[PDB]
């Protein structure tokens, strides 16, 4: 029934808004046109001044302090994604261990999806969109830190060409969380059933919200491959840094 | 709005459950009496047989035991803390400062769940070490555990369940009065909302328990005192037992 699907689409849209302070639409505006624009970081000099103008909550060598900052924020996004997951109908009724398993394996995927919303070919919004860090400044970081972020830019550029909006992404992120193939799952059935319902919703959303965009649904599901590659790749990059107190415990 | 507060109570209960394998409810069901029956350790020979049956000098290896398990508890508390709304958004220095001071307070709160007047569950519930065996240990390990027993006896008379504790330990972590905090106010606003949640919880979950909220807040004094005696005990050991090792995660917590 179209109606239940639209209802679910709306429900997720409203929860995405409440959970994710910095939305795609707001980020878009920030990247385009002005009004008070954000502070730009494009060199060493500018980073330093940015510390003083954008009070960093992560600030307890440069390349590392930048890496720690991505850590602080992705820890914050986990909390946001966790809260959003609880609004997805059926999610809280699942086995608790499965809930934890879906969030653990799903959050990197969702982070890099939503980070795309904050990126363009030239850089990425930071600090709830009051900063902009350029792509080239990210690449110039001593190796191996130079290309931590290049892959995400490559992905976002391609991903952003689908022209999704927040209302589309709300459902897509839901579909990602409910992936029945995560390791260690105890009762895959209700996960897949909820995933099926979300997939039907996503399909109707895309067809309605983008009637002239041929097979968008398919193309969007195909991107879930590019996500998983960005993830295995990121994790390998972490293992390389790890080989070259309470703080640890926070960032396990 | 009591609805937002109940929502917050639910959220904290859910995370407590996800973060802490051995709950108060599970511990009590074990201490009552089954297939969940623990092995009891009450004497030296007894220690030895339980080594075989459960997962240096005696007194030390018991102390290293309590030390390994505090390391584990810190890891669990750290995970739980991040689920508390607003915690991870605070300045990182403050996050570290709140965990440093709040962690032992929570360890002794939660250890009460594992205790009764006669002893304490160990090894996730597989074992039970009697209070007397712990008292008899060569000094200064003799009454390392007595203070915690005295607290637990009094604390357990409040009859809290895990859903109450989830909020209470949230209130403990978010204390704006820790030394060296940078931005006391955001912490206090979080605490205020947690305190309101705790008050609605206690009133709803224990309607006949007069002023339980107050009595619970007063227990924060017994906690701070437990924390003080322990640290002094560690400094005795560091000079008696130059040969005994202390886990660095714990070391950082105590050092300051
Ligand atoms: O020496 C030990 C274990 C010692 C545990 C010791 C211990 C003491 C107080 C505690 C605690 C653990 O947890 C909370 O409070 N063994 C007996 C059990 C099997 C392994 C060896």
Swiss-Prot record, chain A:
Signal peptide: none annotated. Highest expression in adipose tissue. Lower in skeletal muscle, spleen, heart and liver. Also detectable in placenta, lung and ovary. There is a cross-link at residue 18 (Glycyl lysine isopeptide (Lys-Gly) (interchain with G-Cter in ubiquitin)). Changing residue 73 to H: In colon cancer; sporadic; somatic mutation; partial loss of ligand-binding. Residues 4-252 form the NR LBD domain. Induction: (Microbial infection) Expression increases when incubated with M.tuberculosis or its lipoprotein LpqH; induction is TLR2-dependent (at protein level). It is found in: Nucleus; Cytoplasm. Rosiglitazone binds at residues 71-74, 108, 234, 251. Phosphorylated in basal conditions and dephosphorylated when treated with the ligand. May be dephosphorylated by PPP5C. Interacts with FOXO1 (acetylated form). Heterodimer with other nuclear receptors, such as RXRA. The heterodimer with the retinoic acid receptor RXRA is called adipocyte-specific transcription factor ARF6. Interacts with NCOA6 coactivator, leading to a strong increase in transcription of target genes. Interacts with coactivator PPARBP, leading to a mild increase in transcription of target genes. Interacts with NOCA7 in a ligand-inducible manner. Interacts with NCOA1 and NCOA2 LXXLL motifs. Interacts with ASXL1, ASXL2, DNTTIP2, FAM120B, MAP2K1/MEK1, NR0B2, PDPK1, PRDM16, PRMT2 and TGFB1I1. Nuclear receptor that binds peroxisome proliferators such as hypolipidemic drugs and fatty acids. Once activated by a ligand, the nuclear receptor binds to DNA specific PPAR response elements (PPRE) and modulates the transcription of its target genes, such as acyl-CoA oxidase. It therefore controls the peroxisomal beta-oxidation pathway of fatty acids. Key regulator of adipocyte differentiation and glucose homeostasis. ARF6 acts as a key regulator of the tissue-specific adipocyte P2 (aP2) enhancer. The 9aaTAD motif is a transactivation domain present in a large number of yeast and animal transcription factors. Belongs to the nuclear hormone receptor family. NR1 subfamily. It is linked to Defects in PPARG can lead to type 2 insulin-resistant diabetes and hyptertension. PPARG mutations may be associated with colon cancer. This is Peroxisome proliferator-activated receptor gamma. It comes from Homo sapiens. The gene is PPARG. The chain holds residues 235 to 502 of 505 of the full protein.
């Amino acid at each position: 029934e179209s109606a239940d699907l639209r209802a679910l689409a709306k429900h997720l849209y409203d929860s995405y808004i409440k959970s994710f302070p910095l939305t795609k639409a707001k980020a878009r505006a920030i990247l385009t046109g002005k009004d008070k624009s954000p502070f730009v970081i494009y060199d060493m000099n500018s980073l330093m001044m940015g510390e003083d103008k954008i009070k960093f909550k992560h600030i307890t060598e440069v390349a590392i302090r930048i890496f720690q900052g991505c850590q602080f924020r992705s820890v914050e996004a986990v909390q946001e994604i966790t809260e959003y997951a609880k609004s997805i109908p059926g999610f809280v009724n699942l086995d608790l261990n499965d809930q934890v398993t879906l969030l653990k394996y799903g959050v990197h995927e969702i982070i890099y999806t939503m980070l795309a919303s904050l990126m363009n070919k030239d850089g990425v919004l930071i600090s709830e969109g009051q900063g902009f860090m350029t792509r080239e400044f990210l690449k110039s970081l001593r190796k191996p830190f130079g290309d931590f972020m290049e892959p995400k830019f490559e992905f976002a550029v391609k991903f952003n060409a689908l022209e999704l909006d927040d209302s589309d992404l709300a459902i897509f992120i839901a579909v990602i969380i409910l992936s029945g193939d995560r390791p260690g799952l105890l009762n895959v059935k209700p996960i897949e059933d909820i995933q099926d319902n979300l997939l039907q919703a996503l399909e109707l959303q895309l067809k309605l919200n983008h009637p002239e965009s041929s097979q968008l649904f398919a193309k969007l599901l195909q991107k879930m491959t590019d996500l998983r590659q960005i993830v295995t790749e990121h994790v390998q990059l972490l293992q390389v840094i790890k080989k070259t107190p309470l703080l640890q415990e926070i960032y396990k």
